[PDB]
Design an enzyme around this catalytic site. Structure first.
Site, PDB file in Angstrom:
ATOM      1  N   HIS B 144      52.333 102.970  40.065  1.00  0.00           N
ATOM      2  CA  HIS B 144      52.394 104.425  40.262  1.00  0.00           C
ATOM      3  C   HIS B 144      53.128 104.790  41.634  1.00  0.00           C
ATOM      4  CE1 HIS B 144      48.737 105.185  37.553  1.00  0.00           C
ATOM      5  NE2 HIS B 144      49.575 104.518  36.958  1.00  0.00           N
ATOM      6  N   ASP B 163      50.551 108.492  42.913  1.00  0.00           N
ATOM      7  CA  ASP B 163      49.404 108.366  43.419  1.00  0.00           C
ATOM      8  C   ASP B 163      48.781 106.915  43.632  1.00  0.00           C
ATOM      9  OD1 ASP B 163      48.855 107.054  40.980  1.00  0.00           O
ATOM     10  OD2 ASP B 163      46.923 108.374  40.505  1.00  0.00           O
ATOM     11  N   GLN B 168      42.364 103.341  39.115  1.00  0.00           N
ATOM     12  CA  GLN B 168      42.482 102.479  38.072  1.00  0.00           C
ATOM     13  C   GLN B 168      42.961 101.096  38.123  1.00  0.00           C
ATOM     14  OE1 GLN B 168      47.072 102.737  36.636  1.00  0.00           O
ATOM     15  NE2 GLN B 168      45.767 103.524  35.028  1.00  0.00           N
ATOM     16  N   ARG B 228      50.282 112.169  39.294  1.00  0.00           N
ATOM     17  CA  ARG B 228      50.006 110.860  38.849  1.00  0.00           C
ATOM     18  C   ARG B 228      51.060 109.933  38.896  1.00  0.00           C
ATOM     19  NH1 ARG B 228      49.487 107.245  34.711  1.00  0.00           N
ATOM     20  NH2 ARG B 228      47.523 105.961  34.628  1.00  0.00           N
ATOM     21  N   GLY B 247      50.591 110.316  32.644  1.00  0.00           N
ATOM     22  CA  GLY B 247      49.244 110.559  32.352  1.00  0.00           C
ATOM     23  C   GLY B 247      48.335 109.167  32.142  1.00  0.00           C
ATOM     24  N   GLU B 253      52.938 114.392  30.799  1.00  0.00           N
ATOM     25  CA  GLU B 253      53.212 115.720  30.977  1.00  0.00           C
ATOM     26  C   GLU B 253      54.990 116.095  31.188  1.00  0.00           C
ATOM     27  OE1 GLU B 253      51.091 116.900  34.290  1.00  0.00           O
ATOM     28  OE2 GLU B 253      49.290 117.126  33.184  1.00  0.00           O
ATOM     29  N   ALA B 269      43.910 116.526  33.610  1.00  0.00           N
ATOM     30  CA  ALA B 269      44.736 115.787  33.092  1.00  0.00           C
ATOM     31  C   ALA B 269      45.683 116.868  31.897  1.00  0.00           C
ATOM     32  CB  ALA B 269      44.610 114.354  32.200  1.00  0.00           C
ATOM     33  N   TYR B 271      46.439 119.900  30.267  1.00  0.00           N
ATOM     34  CA  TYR B 271      45.840 121.354  30.584  1.00  0.00           C
ATOM     35  C   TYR B 271      44.238 121.280  30.806  1.00  0.00           C
ATOM     36  CZ  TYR B 271      49.738 122.414  27.086  1.00  0.00           C
ATOM     37  OH  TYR B 271      50.867 122.438  26.345  1.00  0.00           O
ATOM     38  N   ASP B 273      41.335 121.864  29.919  1.00  0.00           N
ATOM     39  CA  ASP B 273      40.803 121.919  28.376  1.00  0.00           C
ATOM     40  C   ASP B 273      39.496 121.202  28.135  1.00  0.00           C
ATOM     41  OD1 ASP B 273      42.108 119.564  28.175  1.00  0.00           O
ATOM     42  OD2 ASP B 273      43.700 120.021  26.542  1.00  0.00           O
ATOM     43  N   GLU B 309      37.025 118.676  33.659  1.00  0.00           N
ATOM     44  CA  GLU B 309      38.231 119.482  34.114  1.00  0.00           C
ATOM     45  C   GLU B 309      37.934 121.009  34.486  1.00  0.00           C
ATOM     46  OE1 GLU B 309      40.888 119.083  30.857  1.00  0.00           O
ATOM     47  OE2 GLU B 309      41.906 117.343  31.877  1.00  0.00           O
ATOM     48  N   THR B 348      49.915 108.585  24.138  1.00  0.00           N
ATOM     49  CA  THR B 348      50.767 108.813  25.365  1.00  0.00           C
ATOM     50  C   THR B 348      52.316 108.150  24.960  1.00  0.00           C
ATOM     51  OG1 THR B 348      50.037 106.651  26.465  1.00  0.00           O
ATOM     52  CG2 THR B 348      49.220 108.743  27.327  1.00  0.00           C
TER      53      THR B 348
HETATM   54 CA    CA Z   1      49.455 105.961  30.744  1.00  0.00          CA
HETATM   55 CA    CA Z   2      43.241 118.188  29.868  1.00  0.00          CA
HETATM   56 CA    CA Z   3      49.328 117.726  35.555  1.00  0.00          CA
END
Ligand code: CA
Ligand code: CA
Ligand code: CA
Ligand code: PQQ
Ligand code: CA
Ligand code: CA
Ligand code: CA
Lengths: 448, 452
Positions: B144, B163, B168, B228, B247, B253, B269, B271, B273, B309, B348
């Site tokens: 990344h 990042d 990870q 990210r 992501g 995104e 990550a 929204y 949500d 989140e 993804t």
């Molecule tokens: Ca990924």
């Molecule tokens: Ca989310």
């Molecule tokens: Ca974002």
């Protein structure tokens, strides 16, 4: 966004503000504006009265009563749109919309008319009515009816989906996605003017630069709306909007020319989450029942389309949803006992107001949108960046009370907020339960 | 948005374009640009080579090789940023970023730095010279890195810096710095450890723009935070800044970059949500023996603190314009259709760039106001429509050019009827049937797609 809990709503008491009731004897007060005369002007939806109130003293006068307004006790119809010409001193006109009988029509006996009045300063009343656009759809539900004049000197008007595909109008085919043929338009047939933002010339004619839909330029500016009761221009000319969703996904939208806001095929984001489109007008029998589980669980015999299965064009997602839930969400929350709906993941936004600040601007409220909530008894504050391109953070609740907040404005200095409350209805209490005992029924309240 | 199925991806073949492979077996080709000389210029991340290719003939020349570039075969480091000065005719400068050894490093696991450097192009000798470091001592790691470098209408350098892979895989237990910003003291010492998961905005000489946003009372090179792995960055004709970003197991995104915005990672990550992701902070775990279940924080092993989140208390949060893709908590991240390589079935697309299609005299029908976003894992290039003011997306991300290739970058010719694309030399890709293959059709290629 994710729903707030009853406890989170309960703590939003805004003790940094002083509350004072200015007027308390109003009948279904609906819209309020800061007038060109520095008085507060407000409407009564069922009586058709237009009142003018001194913001400081609370003295009030009934300036005019719009004749023959039609209103149902169990309805959202009546006197709706209300705006001043932006250059009032030189063009003393007031623009309204209202429900009137349609002599040309038993089901839907009425029409909506956008009308202009001339204000006479010497006698202090309204005269010389001119119908700008008549024969618009009318029903008891989802009328919307916000009327504003943009920087372009055009009228922008929200006209809801009329409640098609729910409750009393369950089996009528929703027209939010439909647009007129040149024939219809030529014959003044505005049946497709449901679930739209219209953009009209000041004389009611079609703007030559309106967008084209399915090959025709009509009064339609945007389509695919359910019940957009909030419409407000920002200082840089953008158009913000609030809109009521079904059991979920009330929305804050950015209105762009020719956009399709997805209803009824999409509620909120196109996410297949917590909603699906169950089309009762396409159902087998008109005896089929609506389970009222937002399309996630339906009775046999009604065709269901997922949001991701829709083949629409120019779909524009909301800036913010209030609120979005997952398919595991339970729309039958026991906490609300009999009025199950109050517990749905919605806030029932009744308006949208762009906070302009001023010499006594409230710290941190730059570029905020204020959105009153009927069912939650709060006014939300939603921050945007300085260009009004995106929201920042979440919808922050304020002024929690057992009241149904209907509209909100601020004084020019920005340190006082003026709100209207409904005369009657249900509201969620601090403990999450429902009450129809409103603290300040039909009032004009100020928060300093 | 909701994920496309393997069948939907398989259908996106783009029969309306002619395909011609100009070059293959390039060594990790990474960025390409339409040159001031109307030739294709492209970089090799692994070697530090800057190549120039002729469109009719495919003739290639190694114009320059950036010395001492550091690259790990299993890493995402190497030569990254690549841009020309906008008024090249009068300012013949090329701007790059790359991984170099950091003589000052106090840590063996992270021995390198990233440097943003300028070169001067000499048309007489056809080479690059007079190197000038603009900003050095930036974070560097094998993961990344991001590294997209563009020059805005305001004549500033905009640079994405990822990042670094924190939280990870090999860097699981390192504390993610995407939400962190420098103290005035760190800034004074040129300590850029917080320059992770950011979009930086710098003056052309590397200095801090006085009009950069303030974070915690400090104005640094940071323009936006909370990212990210944003490998795509592109300005629109009306001066807005669009971005694509990778992501975790979900929620790649498309973002609109606004001054001072916080894009939420790693607390959010996509929204905000609480759907399909939660923030599991391994740096705060009870011990380093804990495993990452790789369920996107929805299900985690005991001992790792998880924050929803909606529990995050950060400020100025800006949601994406579009997610590729968002799923619900019930989603199965251990999809058996990808066998021993579960991750390519994750919801993804692994966007590797972002290009604003500008049309031209032979513009492609219907492509007005589109953003082109190549996908590594799905072997497609997405077309995303926006309104004419670039204020919102319209409809969904439309897949194109389906093949067993990892698409890395894309541009169009000035006339707009030809696309030039880069593909990875190696890696995994999803086949038409949804399964995984590491047999790439056009390894390390420069491909031309001409509208019929
Ligand atoms: Ca990924
Ligand atoms: Ca989310
Ligand atoms: Ca974002
Ligand atoms: O989801 C809900 O809980 C709910 C509540 C209410 C309400 O409390 O009035 C309305 C709505 N939805 C509905 O969506 C709606 O369009 C609506 C219009 C009005 C109104 O009073 O003008 N209330 C409501
Ligand atoms: Ca509702
Ligand atoms: Ca919508
Ligand atoms: Ca939805």
């Amino acid at each position: 966004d994710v729903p707030l809990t009853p406890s989170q709503f309960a703590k939003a008491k805004s003790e940094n503000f002083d509350k004072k009731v200015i007027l308390s004897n109003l009948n279904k007060p609906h819209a309020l504006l800061w007038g060109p005369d520095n008085q507060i002007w407000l409407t009564e939806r069922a009586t058709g009265k237009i009142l003018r109130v001194n913001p400081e003293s609370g003295s009030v006068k009934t300036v005019f009563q719009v004749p023959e307004i039609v209103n149902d006790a169990d309805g959202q119809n009546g006197l709706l749109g209300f705006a001043f010409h932006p250059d009032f001193k030189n063009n003393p006109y007031i623009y309204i919309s209202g429900t009137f009988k349609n002599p040309k029509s038993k089901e839907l006996p009425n029409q909506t008319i956008i009308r202009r009045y001339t204000y006479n300063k010497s006698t202090d009343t309204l005269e010389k009515p001119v119908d700008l656009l008549a024969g618009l759809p009318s029903s008891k539900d989802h009328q919307s009816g916000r009327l504003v004049i943009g920087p372009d000197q055009k009228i922008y008007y929200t006209i809801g989906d009329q409640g098609r595909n729910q409750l009393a109008y369950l089996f009528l085919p929703n027209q939010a996605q439909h647009t007129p043929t040149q024939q219809e338009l030529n014959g003044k047939d505005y049946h497709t003017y449901m679930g739209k933002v219209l953009r009209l010339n000041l004389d009611g004619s079609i703007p030559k630069d309106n967008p084209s839909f399915n090959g025709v330029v009509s009064h339609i500016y945007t389509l695919g709306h359910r019940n957009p009761q909030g419409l407000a221009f920002t200082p840089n000319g953008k158009l913000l909007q609030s809109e009521q969703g079904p059991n979920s996904d009330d929305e804050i939208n950015l209105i762009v020319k020719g956009g399709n806001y997805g209803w009824p095929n999409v509620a909120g984001y196109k996410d297949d989450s917590g909603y699906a489109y169950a089309n009762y007008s396409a159902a087998a029998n008109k005896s089929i029942k609506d389970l009222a589980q937002n399309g996630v669980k339906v009775a046999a015999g009604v065709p269901v389309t997922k949001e991701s299965e829709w083949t629409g064009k120019n779909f524009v997602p909301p800036l913010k949803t209030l609120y979005t839930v997952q398919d595991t969400y339970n729309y039958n929350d026991p906490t609300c006992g009999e009025m199950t709906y109050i517990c749905w993941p919605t806030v029932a936004p009744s308006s949208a107001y762009v906070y302009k600040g001023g010499k006594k601007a409230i710290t941190g409220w730059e570029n905020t949108l204020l959105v009153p909530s009927l069912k939650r008894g709060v006014i939300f504050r939603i921050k945007l960046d300085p260009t009004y391109s995106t929201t920042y953070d979440d919808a922050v609740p304020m002024f929690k009370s057992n009241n149904r907040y209907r509209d909100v404005i601020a004084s020019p200095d920005g340190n006082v907020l003026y709100v209207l409350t409904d005369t009657a209805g249900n509201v969620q209490k601090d403990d999450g339960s429902v009450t129809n005992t409103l603290e300040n029924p039909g009032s004009l309240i100020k928060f300093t």
